[PDB]
Amino acid sequence: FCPIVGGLTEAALIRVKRPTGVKARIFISREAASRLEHTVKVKDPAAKVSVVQFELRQSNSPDLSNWARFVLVLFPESFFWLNHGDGISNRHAEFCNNLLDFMDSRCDEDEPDYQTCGPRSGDKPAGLPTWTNSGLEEKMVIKSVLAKCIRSENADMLPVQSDDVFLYSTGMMAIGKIARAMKDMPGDDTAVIFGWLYSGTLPLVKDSGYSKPILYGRGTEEELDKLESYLAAGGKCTVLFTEITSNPQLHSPNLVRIKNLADEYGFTVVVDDTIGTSVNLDILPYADVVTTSLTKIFNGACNAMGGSLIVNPNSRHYRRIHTYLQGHFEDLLFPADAVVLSENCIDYPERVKRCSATARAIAHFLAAHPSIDYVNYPTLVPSREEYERYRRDGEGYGYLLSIVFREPDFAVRFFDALDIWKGPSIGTNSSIALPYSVLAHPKHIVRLSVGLESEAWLRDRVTEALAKATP
Amino acid sequence: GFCPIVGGLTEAALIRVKRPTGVKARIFISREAASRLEHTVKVKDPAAKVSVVQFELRQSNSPDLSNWARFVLVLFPESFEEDAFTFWLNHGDGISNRHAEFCNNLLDFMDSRCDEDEPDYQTCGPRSGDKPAGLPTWTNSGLEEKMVIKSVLAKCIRSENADMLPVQSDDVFLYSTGMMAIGKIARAMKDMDDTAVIFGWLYSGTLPLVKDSGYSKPILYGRGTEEELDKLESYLAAGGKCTVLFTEITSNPQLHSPNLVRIKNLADEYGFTVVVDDTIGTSVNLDILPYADVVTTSLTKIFNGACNAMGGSLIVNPNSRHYRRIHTYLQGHFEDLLFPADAVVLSENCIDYPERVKRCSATARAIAHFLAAHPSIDYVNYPTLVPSREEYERYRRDGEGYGYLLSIVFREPDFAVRFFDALDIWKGPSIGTNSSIALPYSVLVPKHIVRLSVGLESEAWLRDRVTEALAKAT
Numbered sequence: 039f040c041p042i043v044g045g046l047t048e049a050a051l052i053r054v055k056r057p058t059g060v061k062a063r064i065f066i067s068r069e070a071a072s073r074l075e076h077t078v079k080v081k082d083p084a085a086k087v088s089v090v091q092f093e094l095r096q097s098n099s100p101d102l103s104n105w106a107r108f109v110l111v112l113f114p115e116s117f118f119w120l121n122h123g124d125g126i127s128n129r130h131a132e133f134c135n136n137l138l139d140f141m142d143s144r145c146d147e148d149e150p151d152y153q154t155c156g157p158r159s160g161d162k163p164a165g166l167p168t169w170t171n172s173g174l175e176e177k178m179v180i181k182s183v184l185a186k187c188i189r190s191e192n193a194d195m196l197p198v199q200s201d202d203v204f205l206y207s208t209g210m211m212a213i214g215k216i217a218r219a220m221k222d223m224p225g226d227d228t229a230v231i232f233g234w235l236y237s238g239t240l241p242l243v244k245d246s247g248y249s250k251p252i253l254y255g256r257g258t259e260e261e262l263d264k265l266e267s268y269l270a271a272g273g274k275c276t277v278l279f280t281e282i283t284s285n286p287q288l289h290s291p292n293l294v295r296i297k298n299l300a301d302e303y304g305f306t307v308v309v310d311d312t313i314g315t316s317v318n319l320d321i322l323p324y325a326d327v328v329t330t331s332l333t334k335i336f337n338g339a340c341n342a343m344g345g346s347l348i349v350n351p352n353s354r355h356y357r358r359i360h361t362y363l364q365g366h367f368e369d370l371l372f373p374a375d376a377v378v379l380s381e382n383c384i385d386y387p388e389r390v391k392r393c394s395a396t397a398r399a400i401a402h403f404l405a406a407h408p409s410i411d412y413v414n415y416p417t418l419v420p421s422r423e424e425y426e427r428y429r430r431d432g433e434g435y436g437y438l439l440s441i442v443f444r445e446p447d448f449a450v451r452f453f454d455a456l457d458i459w460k461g462p463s464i465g466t467n468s469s470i471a472l473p474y475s476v477l478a479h480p481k482h483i484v485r486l487s488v489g490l491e492s493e494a495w496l497r498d499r500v501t502e503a504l505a506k507a508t509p
Numbered sequence: 510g511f512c513p514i515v516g517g518l519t520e521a522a523l524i525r526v527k528r529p530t531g532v533k534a535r536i537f538i539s540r541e542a543a544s545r546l547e548h549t550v551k552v553k554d555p556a557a558k559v560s561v562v563q564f565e566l567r568q569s570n571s572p573d574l575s576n577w578a579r580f581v582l583v584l585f586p587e588s589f590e591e592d593a594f595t596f597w598l599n600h601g602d603g604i605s606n607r608h609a610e611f612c613n614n615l616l617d618f619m620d621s622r623c624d625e626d627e628p629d630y631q632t633c634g635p636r637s638g639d640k641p642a643g644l645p646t647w648t649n650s651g652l653e654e655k656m657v658i659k660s661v662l663a664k665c666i667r668s669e670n671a672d673m674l675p676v677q678s679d680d681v682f683l684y685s686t687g688m689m690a691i692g693k694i695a696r697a698m699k700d701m702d703d704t705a706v707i708f709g710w711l712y713s714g715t716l717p718l719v720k721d722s723g724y725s726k727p728i729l730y731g732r733g734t735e736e737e738l739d740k741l742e743s744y745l746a747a748g749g750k751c752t753v754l755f756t757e758i759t760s761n762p763q764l765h766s767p768n769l770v771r772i773k774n775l776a777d778e779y780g781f782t783v784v785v786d787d788t789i790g791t792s793v794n795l796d797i798l799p800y801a802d803v804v805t806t807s808l809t810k811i812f813n814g815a816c817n818a819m820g821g822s823l824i825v826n827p828n829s830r831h832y833r834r835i836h837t838y839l840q841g842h843f844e845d846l847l848f849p850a851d852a853v854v855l856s857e858n859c860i861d862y863p864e865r866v867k868r869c870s871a872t873a874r875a876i877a878h879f880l881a882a883h884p885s886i887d888y889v890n891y892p893t894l895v896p897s898r899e900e901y902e903r904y905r906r907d908g909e910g911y912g913y914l915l916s917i918v919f920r921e922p923d924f925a926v927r928f929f930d931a932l933d934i935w936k937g938p939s940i941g942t943n944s945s946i947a948l949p950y951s952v953l954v955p956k957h958i959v960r961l962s963v964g965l966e967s968e969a970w971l972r973d974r975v976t977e978a979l980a981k982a983t
């Protein structure tokens with residue numbers, strides 16, 4: 039069985055004499071851990087929920103004692119998930135499992151079973167990690183590249199600096215941090231979620247204190263008319279959340295009109311540019327804050343975790359937003375994860391351009407097939423000309439697309455005959471498809487993230503799948 | 510299955526060859542290993558399609574990348590149910606965990622070749638020829654780290670007292686698993702004349718390893734008793750042939766120790782080579798070099814302790830009459846199959862390998878005697894308590910302890926079951942871990958025995974987890 043990978047939760051549950059009877063989750067943030075405790079306590083009071091702090095307590099190595107700690111949360115089996123942004127990183131968990139014998143346990147409400155001292159606590163580990171100084175050199179490579187590929191083609195716009203970029207453990211943690219930041223500043227606090235679903239943003243915004251936000255599902259011009267009618271009447275609005283190159287329909291919102299409404303009614307615009315990249319699009323003039331999941335195409339390798347937060351120095355709220363984000367900043371991006379991101383980010387522009395070219399060819403190849411009703415891709419969707427107001431010159435139309443077949447039961451046979459990776463993540467170096475089975479947490483849509491493979495390769499796997507689906 | 514995904518090299522390779530469904534797969538480093546699996550499936554169902562696809566990163570400017578980013582993919586129908594022979598021959602020949610994630614990161618830069626003409630297995634990587642985004646943190650195939658491993662192994666087998674030559678680092682051979690070391694030495698001895706003795710050694714892969722190696726006349730001796738040695742001597746005196754004998758110093762799971770002195774004396778009179786595995790009874794605790802021609806060691810176990818690296822060891826005794834025969838063969842046919850990242854971890858954790866052995870021998874001794882004096886316990890298998898005790902006290906260095914492994918035989922089997930399930934420690938088949946672990950007879954001699962690998966925790970800690978389990982078993 040051994041060498042074993044994973045097992046930090048099994049090892050931690052053994053250390054607290056609870057291998058059974060409870061479920062467990064591991065966080066780096068006690069803030070995020072406490073939120074899970076509240077979620078269970080507000081669904082069932084008197085439920086035993088304990089929050090155990092593991093720490094490597096007595097070391098003179100600053101790297102180890104600042105990173106070899108985690109928070110274990112126990113709750114009843116009776117038993118959020120869209121909050122998969124605050125859990126322990128994969129490489130962070132394997133780091134803390136290797137050092138668990140050197141770590142001690144604390145719990146505030148003292149159940150004496152949760153106060154354990156490690157078998158080797160105080161002793162020196164057999165080796166040091168390969169990264170040094172919290173991986174802050176690799177974190178600055180990440181911040182510089184993120185800042186350099188969002189620089190706008192407008193030469194009269196202030197550039198983005200590395201210190202205007204904030205790194206977090208996931209893209210959802212980045213969205214959570216900016217949502218909690220806008221709530222804490224004074225004034226009213228009603229948020230607008232515009233053209234953004236099939237993500238964790240709505241639950242995260244609700245849990246960050248916006249008790250219920252104005253949802254605009256589609257991201258249409260009519261939707262914007264309803265928003266403007268409400269603002270002109272005297273309605274309040276402090277922050278708007280939207281995503282550039284929306285999923286899974288590849289819609290593009292009117293960032294110009296959104297920015298114009300923000301300019302007269304004084305709210306903050308948060309745009310996520312994970313799907314439509316900053317390599318392909320120039321959205322800096324229209325966003326006050328840009329969120330990006332580094333786990334996706336930024337990394338490509340699908341072996342590292344990260345999230346980014348870009349505060350626009352051209353924003354009327356730059357100063358207020360940056361002061362809060364830096365005021366409450368905590369380095370929660372595990373260094374090993376930062377090492378991989380800083381290496382794979384070097385060819386992030388090149389890889390984006392490559393899979394946008396192939397995605398355009400595959401989208402138009404699929405569009406011309408009789409079994410397909412229509413294909414959702416920026417070159418083919420009604421927002422086509424909207425996508426072009428922001429498209430950088432010489433650049434393409436993204437790596438994501440979705441297929442709507444004519445008959446739903448053809449979509450199912452096609453998806454099963456399609457010999458490529460299947461799963462929920464996007465921005466991978468290998469192409470991946472998702473059905474409506476997942477993404478449900480048209481009802482026969484098939485989403486496709488296009489990777490780095492040749493156009494002949496992807497064309498072959500799609501054709502063969504269409505053949506086996508066709509009677 | 511959200512990204513980052515751990516593992517998935519086998520799923521990614523199956524997609525590359527257009528066979529994500531309908532087939533089973535195994536990934537090896539050696540072509541010989543792959544060919545052995547193919548034969549085993551072909552002789553149980555000849556009409557089964559078995560293909561062997563070699564993945565390789567062919568041309569890199571770093572020699573590290575192109576020599577280690579290569580693996581062998583073996584596909585066979587799902588109809589095949591794996592037997593014990595293939596199970597163990599796969600547990601010793603499979604790709605290491607860190608080696609699998611290394612080649613998954615580089616799979617886009619690798620191409621596929623197949624000897625048999627199936628065009629679906631002749632693929633070019635999407636990024637083939639391009640430069641990888643980064644280099645591994647280890648350099649020069651980790652041969653500096655590998656020299657620490659060979660140096661440490663050589664220093665703690667240096668036979669005490671007597672009058673023998675010391676073991677140098679170049680007498681140590683590193684392999685990917687403990688069984689790969691046993692497999693390599695078994696095939697080496699075939700060239701000489703084909704009778705192998707496996708002595709006090711089961712619950713291991715040595716029988717499949719030796720049988721598949723070519724020994725056409727095997728002799729199994731389950732316990733390692735003196736009475737089984739009498740059967741061997743009667744057979745040798747009668748004129749029987751025997752070329753190699755396999756034994757483990759402290760047996761699994763009864764902690765028995767064979768008469769290595771008598772075994773070595775028989776080897777000196779009938780001219781066969783003795784291979785001793787010292788994984789359980791360590792080289793820190795025991796001095797067995799005078800009685801073995803070859804010593805094998807699983808580095809995955811207490812040598813590493815952290816249960817996060819894979820390695821196997823082969824030490825050729827320079828005081829052996831066959832030293833120059835066996836050493837020449839092992840290097841005549843040597844291939845570096847220890848992934849450098851695995852060697853880096855082993856080279857770090859081995860530095861306190863003697864210290865950790867002493868720590869978990871002390872705790873295991875205290876807990877063994879605690880269990881022995883409990884009314885619910887019939888007897889405990891530990892070198893201080895077994896009839897084989899006095900056999901260990903000859904090979905045992907003084908100031909050193911009695912090992913980290915023990916097994917418990919309760920008086921009532923249904924007490925053993927309730928005890929094992931109430932026992933709040935790690936459960937699994939591996940031993941030599943830094944945290945203590947238990948195994949029932951489900952996995953793996955009474956059929957209610959409970960085996961225990963003792964880790965680095967206090968006696969107060971281990972006694973507490975044991976006592977509480979005993980309470981709930983009453």
Ligand SMILES: CCOC(=O)CC(C)=O
Pocket residue numbers: 210236237238285462463464477
């Ligand atoms: C966390 C965002 O997840 C996605 O990338 C889109 C999805 C849920 O399928």
